[PDB]
């Protein structure tokens, strides 16, 4: 019934679609996802057998891939699908949002331009923007124990929140940064340099920022922020946490 | 410098306060609180050479208890004190907010009639609700591994929100609540009758829910939410996770 295994056949399928602005993906691909002005694609490669278990269409502006409900389970589960193999590939003209949740990989690889971007993901899974991300806003949340990671930034602004106990990791220039932790996890910015940054921790968590002119630091609990760079510091902590200053 | 070990020879404190309506607590004592009508009454119990390393007054309306910071290390950090006994015992006409941090405990005894009351923790700690709350609103907030036990509540509404992995336990009768998940950890509210319930987690946590006429549930991750009650549920999964119906 709830558990699938993939038989060991691998089949690549093209699937039809519009242009999407918007992404849910939920499951264990290797998903490789791109802005581009040429033509929507869709490409998923999985045991030939999981197909029947899988939902993969785009739908009012939004690509939506995930595991089917279980039939007759009235929607209050889905499959648990074990595949061999399952990779995706696929582009539109913007992705304005992605909404991932699972133990799967979301990349993009080439030089993106934002306007805004808001990566949310649950769950164990990563998400790596390795290409040059330059323009207005990107937003980078989580809840779980996965990461994210975005290596080429360039922009306005900066938002990242982390839930639980995983890792957000950025590197590059941001005129503002918001960096928040309610968890165990870390925020690691160091080499993402921010003219202005604030920082929030609830709990155990923590934060390294790198601020040039102007850095509020705020930890409710036994977390840290440890900062670099010459900004004017305000500084609150309620709790056994702490601040300190590095090279 | 930063540890200071209590001397083994505790001294109690009664410190003349005014009234407060919100506290700050900061540490790891048994600290027990009642609403009166009474004048405001601060004791604290402690080892006789912590005192000089803790802050304990009434300012704007805050009863404030915490460790200080160390002396001339700028506020980046506070003492770690390691007291053989510590309690503290307050009242006040009414406790609108309660920030907590810490592996202290926080008790309420005595039947406790509120308006609106806040409770904030963060840390390992936990604060028993134990006698009878009624009233207009009750909302308790955590981040951490600690617990919210609220054992005898009547309200109007209730709110509660965890982060991390810790758990809030609501036992009694509402009209309508708000339950949230944000992490690994547990709401328990099977035995908190609500008419209208709306229930959400992000990543892995699970909540137990009583809920007669109407319940939200939304997952987003691989959590679950339990409900009982025969109410109208609108239904909402975005992972691998599940919601169940028990008898
Ligand atoms: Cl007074």
Not at 78 to 98: A, H
Not at 168 to 173: K, L, M, R
Not at 209 to 218: M, S
Request: some cysteine; aromatic content about 6%; charged content about 25%.
């Amino acid at each position: 019934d709830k558990r699938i295994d993939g038989n060991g056949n691998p089949e690549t399928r093209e699937i039809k679609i519009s242009d999407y602005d918007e992404i849910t993906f939920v499951g264990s691909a290797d998903f490789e996802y791109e802005q581009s002005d040429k033509a929507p694609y869709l490409s998923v490669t999985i045991d030939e057998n999981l197909f029947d278990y899988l939902v993969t269409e785009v739908e009012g502006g939004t690509l939506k891939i995930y595991p089917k409900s279980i039939k007759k389970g009235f929607n209050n589960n889905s499959y648990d699908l074990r595949p061999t193999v399952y990779k995706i590939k696929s582009n539109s003209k913007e992705l304005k949002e992605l909404n991932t949740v699972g133990s799967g990989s979301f990349i993009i690889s080439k030089p993106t331009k934002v306007n805004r971007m808001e990566i949310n993901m649950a769950g164990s899974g990563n998400v790596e923007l390795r290409g040059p991300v330059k323009g207005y806003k990107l937003e980078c949340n989580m809840a779980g124990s996965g990461n994210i990671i975005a290596k080429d930034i360039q922009l306005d602004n900066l938002s990242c929140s982390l839930a639980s106990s995983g890792e957000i990791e950025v590197i590059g220039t941001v005129d503002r940064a918001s960096f928040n932790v309610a968890g165990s996890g870390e925020i690691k910015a160091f080499d993402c340099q921010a003219r202005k940054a604030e920082c929030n921790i609830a709990s155990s968590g923590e934060i390294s920022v790198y601020a040039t002119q102007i850095l509020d630091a705020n930890i409710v609990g036994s977390g840290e922020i440890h900062y670099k760079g010459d900004p004017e510091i305000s500084k609150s902590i309620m709790g056994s946490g702490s601040i300190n200053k590095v090279k």
